[PDB]
Design an enzyme around this catalytic site. Structure first.
Site, PDB file in Angstrom:
ATOM      1  N   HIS A  41       0.812  -1.209   0.000  1.00  0.00           N
ATOM      2  CA  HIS A  41       0.000   0.000   0.000  1.00  0.00           C
ATOM      3  C   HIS A  41       0.849   1.264   0.000  1.00  0.00           C
ATOM      4  CE1 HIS A  41       0.488  -0.004   4.485  1.00  0.00           C
ATOM      5  NE2 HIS A  41       0.436   1.304   4.302  1.00  0.00           N
ATOM      6  N   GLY A 143       3.413   5.553  10.133  1.00  0.00           N
ATOM      7  CA  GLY A 143       4.757   5.413   9.632  1.00  0.00           C
ATOM      8  C   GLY A 143       5.454   4.137  10.039  1.00  0.00           C
ATOM      9  N   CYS A 145       4.309   1.186   9.256  1.00  0.00           N
ATOM     10  CA  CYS A 145       4.101   0.163   8.231  1.00  0.00           C
ATOM     11  C   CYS A 145       5.443  -0.342   7.726  1.00  0.00           C
ATOM     12  CB  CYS A 145       3.289   0.704   7.048  1.00  0.00           C
ATOM     13  SG  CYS A 145       1.646   1.282   7.464  1.00  0.00           S
TER      14      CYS A 145
HETATM   15  C1  LIG Z   1       1.909   3.115   7.479  1.00  0.00           C
HETATM   16  O1  LIG Z   1       1.324   4.114   6.710  1.00  0.00           O
HETATM   17  C2  LIG Z   1       1.375   3.018   8.887  1.00  0.00           C
HETATM   18  O2  LIG Z   1       2.205   2.701   9.735  1.00  0.00           O
HETATM   19  N1  LIG Z   1       0.024   3.155   9.205  1.00  0.00           N
HETATM   20  C3  LIG Z   1      -0.308   2.884  10.593  1.00  0.00           C
HETATM   21  C4  LIG Z   1      -0.039   1.588  11.042  1.00  0.00           C
HETATM   22  N2  LIG Z   1      -0.272   1.149  12.287  1.00  0.00           N
HETATM   23  C5  LIG Z   1      -0.818   2.021  13.136  1.00  0.00           C
HETATM   24  C6  LIG Z   1      -1.137   3.309  12.766  1.00  0.00           C
HETATM   25 CL1  LIG Z   1      -1.854   4.358  13.934  1.00  0.00          CL
HETATM   26  C7  LIG Z   1      -0.895   3.772  11.482  1.00  0.00           C
HETATM   27  C8  LIG Z   1      -1.078   3.487   8.307  1.00  0.00           C
HETATM   28  C9  LIG Z   1      -1.384   4.831   8.089  1.00  0.00           C
HETATM   29  C10 LIG Z   1      -2.437   5.203   7.263  1.00  0.00           C
HETATM   30  C11 LIG Z   1      -3.217   4.234   6.654  1.00  0.00           C
HETATM   31  C12 LIG Z   1      -2.940   2.887   6.875  1.00  0.00           C
HETATM   32  C13 LIG Z   1      -3.760   1.834   6.240  1.00  0.00           C
HETATM   33  C14 LIG Z   1      -5.155   1.906   6.103  1.00  0.00           C
HETATM   34  C15 LIG Z   1      -5.861   0.872   5.496  1.00  0.00           C
HETATM   35  C16 LIG Z   1      -5.201  -0.259   5.034  1.00  0.00           C
HETATM   36  C17 LIG Z   1      -3.821  -0.304   5.168  1.00  0.00           C
HETATM   37 CL2  LIG Z   1      -2.886  -1.653   4.618  1.00  0.00          CL
HETATM   38  C18 LIG Z   1      -3.103   0.705   5.763  1.00  0.00           C
HETATM   39  C19 LIG Z   1      -1.868   2.511   7.708  1.00  0.00           C
END
Ligand SMILES: *[C@@H](O)C(=O)N(c1cncc(Cl)c1)c1cccc(-c2cccc(Cl)c2)c1
Ligand SMILES: *[C@@H](O)C(=O)N(c1cncc(Cl)c1)c1cccc(-c2cccc(Cl)c2)c1
Lengths: 306, 306
Positions: A41, A143, A145
């Site tokens: 993504h 961030g 991810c």
């Molecule tokens: C990477 O963008 C990220 O680390 N996100 C995130 C991950 N874990 C916790 C939190 Cl609070 C944020 C992130 C940020 C925005 C969107 C998304 C997302 C939405 C829907 C599907 C996916 Cl795969 C990712 C994740």
């Protein structure tokens, strides 16, 4: 003695963490040999994330659309492909810090260390269990991810988890390193939710053995119980069933403590029916279920990794 | 979101861990530049440990009595000296993996990551607090002597703890990296004991703020309390006094959550008087006191290290 939520030393994984940028999206990638693995993504905009056609999105990308930073060194992307929910970015440099590794998929109930990273830079390390509902109760901010989960077996890093997203209850969903999600989750923005969890019974028992090894004995008793009669109680308290294989896996702990597995089950039964009555076990007022029997043996015997 | 007991990435410290052998005693050393630091009781026999004259014991040693193994490479010892309770072994090779570092001594109530090692090989990493009684509730087995505790600030490793011994209650005592013990403990076999502990009040409050940031709010209330009136309650439950400096340190968390520090104190007051009534906070049924305000900000904001 003592018992802590212990993660594996993270050094070998730290040397693999890179920053992957595509458009305005930056997240973490995992750089092994000449491939960088990251959540697909990364190629999405916000509007993309509501009904993404990732094959469509990726064909519109070029190698130069992917900026990979390994520290303060930029890695030239020379190839890209999708494998399930991860991107494989082929880079012109093999990571000289590549450890011996495997991509393994873990079972709910098994634990792993998470190296939380932001912008390719390791932030913290902590131990996680794969919940029965295929979520993990992690600590991840925007961030993170691409942060990976892993175990270490002597010198070999078994990567098991790459972080993709946070679910509405604050738990975390991700993939194995082949890009296959753990549990019924997809990398788009839907109303997906975790789904009901259970307590990992064999782990609770393992931790009770850890407690006994560490001198907490107040919850022991002379009673025993049959496997079937324990499982009637486990079901009532949303614990998953205990199997003979669990009993066998608990054998070493049983033999070291002299407490028969079924006797420890009788103790767990009483703890479930009576609560803890103001007492604690290994500094917890809750029955802890994120230590596997292996974790307990490792920590209460002292295995290292090189 | 989410909140975990998070240790610092351990890689930079892993590259410093070596094995120090003297006689039949093997423990861990910390190899920075061309010095290896290790507990001086490495030079002791069991009989030595009951009334050791370490100056006497060390003068009877030669450089060749110290076998230092850095991985599968033997480091030639070219000098040795005592500094308080640590040995400084001068080796003919500077550690090429020496990070930027400092030796810092921490305060009770502050936290650090412990890299548990055996035979110079890192085993696990976990987060510890220095208890008010200058012990740490660690996880250490025989052979973990010399494992170090540390924090990381951007790229600089602040070493604060070297492990020396386990006390009879299963808690751990050690030194800073200048060899000065934390607390009233000595590196001989006496009847020393930990001494009464208190709960680190400012940390509990920080963790309550972490909980609010992470969506646990059930323990909030409209009441407030004065600092003095809270401290009357803290004293009664063996919590240490809250000071205006603690209140100031909690300011950022207060401002981010909109909950006045004294309001959170009123919540803690009720939690102390009423217990938790079957509820949990950040997956704990106990008031957690091993997260500093800095730990909470770091984890609930997302600072990394490079
Ligand atoms: C990477 O963008 C990220 O680390 N996100 C995130 C991950 N874990 C916790 C939190 Cl609070 C944020 C992130 C940020 C925005 C969107 C998304 C997302 C939405 C829907 C599907 C996916 Cl795969 C990712 C994740
Ligand atoms: C190193 O020998 C070691 O790691 N010891 C140890 C440390 N922490 C926990 C446990 Cl269970 C063991 C260790 C082993 C034997 C003796 C001592 C010791 C006794 C008295 C004073 C000192 Cl400094 C050390 C420590």
């Amino acid at each position: 003695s003592g018992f802590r939520k212990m993660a594996f030393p993270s050094g070998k994984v730290e040397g693999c963490m890179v920053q992957v940028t595509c458009g305005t999206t930056t997240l973490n990638g995992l750089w092994l040999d000449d491939v960088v693995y990251c959540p697909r993504h990364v190629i999405c905009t916000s509007e993309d994330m509501l009904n993404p056609n990732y094959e469509d999105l990726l064909i519109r990308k070029s190698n130069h659309n992917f900026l990979v930073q390994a520290g303060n060194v930029q890695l030239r992307v020379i190839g890209h492909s999708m494998q399930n929910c991860v991107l494989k970015l082929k880079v012109d440099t093999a990571n000289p810090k590549t450890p011996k590794y495997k991509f393994v998929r873990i079972q709910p109930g098994q634990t792993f260390s998470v190296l939380a990273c932001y912008n390719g830079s390791p932030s913290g390390v902590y131990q996680c269990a794969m919940r029965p509902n295929f979520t993990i109760k992690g600590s991840f901010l925007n961030g993170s991810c691409g942060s990976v989960g892993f175990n270490i077996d002597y010198d070999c890093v078994s990567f098991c988890y790459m972080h993709h997203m946070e679910l509405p209850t604050g738990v975390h969903a991700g993939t194995d390193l082949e890009g296959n999600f753990y549990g019924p989750f997809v990398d788009r923005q839907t109303a997906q939710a975790a789904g009901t969890d259970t307590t990992i019974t064999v782990n609770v028992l393992a931790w009770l053995y850890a407690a006994v090894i560490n001198g907490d004995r107040w919850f022991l008793n002379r009673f025993t119980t049959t496997l079937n009669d324990f499982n009637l109680v486990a079901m009532k308290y949303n614990y998953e069933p205990l199997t003979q294989d669990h009993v066998d896996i608990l054998g070493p702990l049983s033999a070291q403590t002299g407490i028969a597995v079924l006797d420890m089950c009788a103790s767990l039964k009483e703890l479930l029916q009576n609560g803890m009555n103001g007492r604690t076990i290994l500094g917890s007022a809750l029955l802890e279920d994120e230590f596997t029997p292996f974790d307990v043996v490792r920590q209460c015997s002292g295995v290292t990794f090189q």
